[PDB]
């Protein structure tokens, strides 16, 4: 599994550019910020709900512990 006999690809052309002739931070904020926003928008609906559920359970359990540790009028 070394370069030269990995696969068989045809009719593809790739153009590149020397790292010494192109900027290393091309529009790091002009397109960085919108790209980040799209990335988080397309994943928050799947990532957040479990952790938000955990936060609700954490706070409920902690306050349940706190007000179960009090004294019962008797």
């Amino acid at each position: 599994r070394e370069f030269g006999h990995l696969t068989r690809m045809r009719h593809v052309i790739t153009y590149s550019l020397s790292p010494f002739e192109q900027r290393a931070f091309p529009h790091y904020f002009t397109k960085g910020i919108p790209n980040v926003l799209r990335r988080t928008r397309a994943c928050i609906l799947r990532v957040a709900p479990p952790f938000v559920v955990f936060y609700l359970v954490y706070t409920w359990g902690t306050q349940e512990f706190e007000k179960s540790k009090r004294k019962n009028p008797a």
Binding site: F3, G4, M9, I13, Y15, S18, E21
Partner: protein, 440 residues
């Protein structure tokens, strides 16, 4: 004769100039034949995106017919007297040369005027040649050497007219009309950018008389090109169905004049050239060639020094199988860096001798001599006599090579064009890192 009296005894090429700016130049000799040609300073480098490919079209149409000689009549004169008419159009030059008997020089020059001045450019002829150029483009797609060199020019001079191929895109071929060709021949075949060069048994006075009698009624007394920008990049046309993989790696070389041309050629002569069907092979003093013959890395390689007016490509092109690109690229970069870092006197002497052989042996026969006259008058502005070349090569030494190669090779971003099964070809970062040595 001690090779010094030999060089001194070479006949001098007289150069004159008509009022139109026609630089009539000739190199008399004793042969009964001669080669008389016209070198135009036209080419794809002078063509915009829309006009690209018009030079090749005009070259194709040149020999078909003229106003004075309708169609095959122009052909009829050429063969009936035994002359061989030929043309070639590179990226920055064009030429029409007619090899013929020294006796038929009065006729040939006249024909050479007719082809250049009074062309025909017939519309039906244009359609037929349009078809022919399309099939010729499909032919040129076949061989990988021309394709790879055009890829190199595209990826090295991207965004500049130099990137344009000589034949032009197939789109322009269909969409080029007669008006474009007429305008191209009007504004690019102007008198000042012309060299009428003749070799063989032609006397300069007769050539001047013929030029003044046939070429007088030419242009009087502008697209003067722009300095193209080398942009180190890489093109990879990965096509595994091809048998062999052609790679060409070139750095920004010198210009046409750029005295550093003389050392660099010597340096390239050190690397030399090789292919499968060579002679000594594993004993040739070129280290890269010896390694290639010993380990059978490639079926071919050569070192090219394509140099244009203001810039040029200097590097090597090799043809090897699908699983030896990395090793041969490594050895090639190693030879380059060895020359820049430590050239050694003996290799420099071998390079000087090899370059002397190049210049001397190339300049034999009427056709190469006339071609040299035209090209030198167009590029250098003069014809560099072989004695001057000898002196310039003699001035070269190990230090000069070590410095000149260092200025052009060491730590320079190269331009790479690979085609075929080039999966093995190293990534551009590895290639660029090969240009510099951490031991030096």
């Amino acid at each position: 004769a001690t090779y010094a009296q030999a060089l001194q005894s070479v006949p001098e090429t007289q150069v004159s100039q008509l009022d139109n700016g026609l630089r009539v130049a000739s190199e008399q000799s004793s042969q009964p034949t001669c080669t008389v040609g016209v070198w135009i300073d036209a080419g794809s480098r002078y063509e915009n995106e829309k006009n690209n490919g018009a030079g090749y079209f005009v070259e194709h149409l040149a020999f078909k017919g003229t106003k004075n000689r309708p169609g095959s009549a122009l052909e009829k004169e050429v063969e009936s007297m035994g002359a061989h008419l030929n043309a070639y159009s590179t990226r920055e030059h064009t030429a029409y040369y007619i090899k013929a008997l020294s006796k038929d020089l009065p006729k040939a020059v006249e024909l050479l005027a007719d082809i250049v001045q009074n062309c025909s450019l017939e519309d039906s002829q244009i359609e037929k040649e349009r078809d022919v150029i399309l099939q010729e483009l499909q032919e040129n797609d076949s061989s990988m050497r021309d394709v790879v060199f055009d890829y190199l020019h595209a990826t090295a001079f991207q965004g500049t007219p130099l990137a344009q191929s000589v034949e032009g895109p197939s789109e322009n071929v269909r969409k080029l009309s007669r008006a474009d060709l007429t305008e191209y021949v009007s504004q690019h075949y102007k008198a000042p950018r012309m060299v009428l060069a003749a070799a063989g048994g032609v006397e300069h006075r007769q050539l001047l008389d013929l030029a003044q009698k046939h070429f007088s009624s030419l242009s009087g007394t502008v697209p003067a090109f722009t300095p193209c920008r080398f942009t180190g990049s890489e093109i990879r046309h990965r096509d595994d169905a091809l048998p062999l993989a052609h790679v060409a790696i070139a750095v920004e070389g010198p210009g046409w004049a750029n005295p550093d041309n003389v050392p660099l050629q010597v340096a390239n002569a050190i690397i030399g050239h090789y292919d499968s069907t060579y002679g000594g092979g594993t004993h040739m003093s070129s280290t890269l060639a010896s390694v290639a013959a010993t380990r059978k890395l490639c079926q071919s390689f050569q070192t090219f020094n394509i140099c244009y007016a203001e810039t040029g490509l200097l590097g090597a092109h090799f043809v090897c199988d699908n699983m030896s690109i990395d090793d041969m690229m490594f050895f090639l970069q190693g030879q380059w860096m060895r020359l820049c870092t430590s050239a050694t006197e003996s290799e420099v002497v071998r390079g000087k001798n090899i370059l002397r052989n190049a210049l001397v042996s190339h300049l034999d026969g009427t056709t190469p001599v006339c071609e040299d006259i035209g090209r030198s008058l167009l590029t250098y502005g003069r014809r560099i006599p072989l004695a001057e070349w000898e002196s310039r090569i003699a001035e070269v030494d190990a230090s000069v090579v070590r410095e000149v190669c260092s200025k052009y090779f060491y730590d320079q971003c190269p331009a790479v064009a690979g085609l075929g099964p080039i999966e093995q070809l190293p990534d551009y970062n590895r290639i660029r890192s090969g240009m510099f040595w951490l031991r030096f």
